[PDB]
Curated annotation (Swiss-Prot):
Annotated EC: 3.4.21.-
GO cellular component, one term: extracellular region
Record protein name field: Staphylococcal superantigen-like 1
Domain of life of the source: Bacteria
The organism's taxonomic lineage, starting at the top: Bacteria, Bacillati, Bacillota, Bacilli, Bacillales
Keyword annotations: Hydrolase, Protease, Secreted, Signal, Virulence
Part of the intact protein present: 38 to 226 of 226
Function: Mediates virulence by proteolytically cleaving host proteins, including collagens types I and IV as well as human cytokines IL8, IL17A, and IFN-gamma.
Species, as recorded: Staphylococcus aureus (strain NCTC 8325 / PS 47)
Record bears the keyword Coiled coil: no
Quaternary structure and interacting proteins, as annotated: Homodimer.
Record-stated family: Belongs to the staphylococcal/streptococcal toxin family.
Entry keyword Chaperone: no
Length: 189
């Protein structure tokens, strides 16, 4: 549903880099606990992120946190969005790829997307692209609600995301090489 999708993709984000978190298991499930200031978060690990970080204390991780429900308890319960921090710390490289956005198969923008992160999560790319389609092009308003983001890598590999649904939760912890994104296409209809 249209209004629910806009709700979800207008939730605020807690985004921090070079943090430390604690990875544990508890009743067949896998979690990462993280505290940034007096702000407290528990991130469920569902996909391949389960095996990508070893249980126990994890340093040099970046975090992209979104609170799944509407309950107003202080602790954040999020899914995925954990990646390895940049392995070059002393310079911040930012690379452009091409960014193209389409409504009803005509371009409405042809420009650039900027990427600072070596290891970047589909949770983050999904959220931020939808944020842009929503705020500047009126996804998900009247009722523009379908589909296709396509991220094309340097080797021709692609990742595609349906706009008519939230990103699949098992994909929110998947990550790609942000230094090697050649193009991002967002088609709306």
């Amino acid at each position: 549903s249209e209004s629910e999708l806009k709700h979800y993709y207008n939730k605020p984000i807690l985004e921090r880099k070079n943090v430390t978190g604690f990875k544990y298991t508890d009743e067949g499930k896998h979690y990462l606990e993280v505290t940034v200031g007096q702000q407290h978060s528990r991130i469920t690990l569902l996909g391949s992120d389960k095996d990508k970080f070893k249980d126990g204390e994890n340093s040099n991780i970046d975090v992209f946190i979104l609170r799944e429900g509407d309950s107003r308890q202080a602790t954040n319960y999020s899914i995925g969005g954990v990646t390895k921090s940049n392995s070059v710390q002393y310079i911040d490289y930012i690379n452009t790829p091409i960014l193209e956005i389409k409504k009803d198969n005509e371009d409405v923008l042809k420009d650039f997307y900027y990427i600072s992160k070596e290891d970047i999560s589909l949770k983050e790319l999904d959220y931020r692209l939808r944020e842009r389609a929503i705020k500047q092009h009126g996804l998900y308003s009247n009722g523009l609600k379908q589909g296709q983001i396509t991220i094309t890598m340097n080797d021709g590999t692609t990742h595609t995301i349906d706009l008519s649904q939230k990103l699949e939760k098992e994909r929110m912890g998947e990550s790609i090489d942000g230094t090697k994104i050649n193009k991002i296409l967002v088609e709306m209809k």
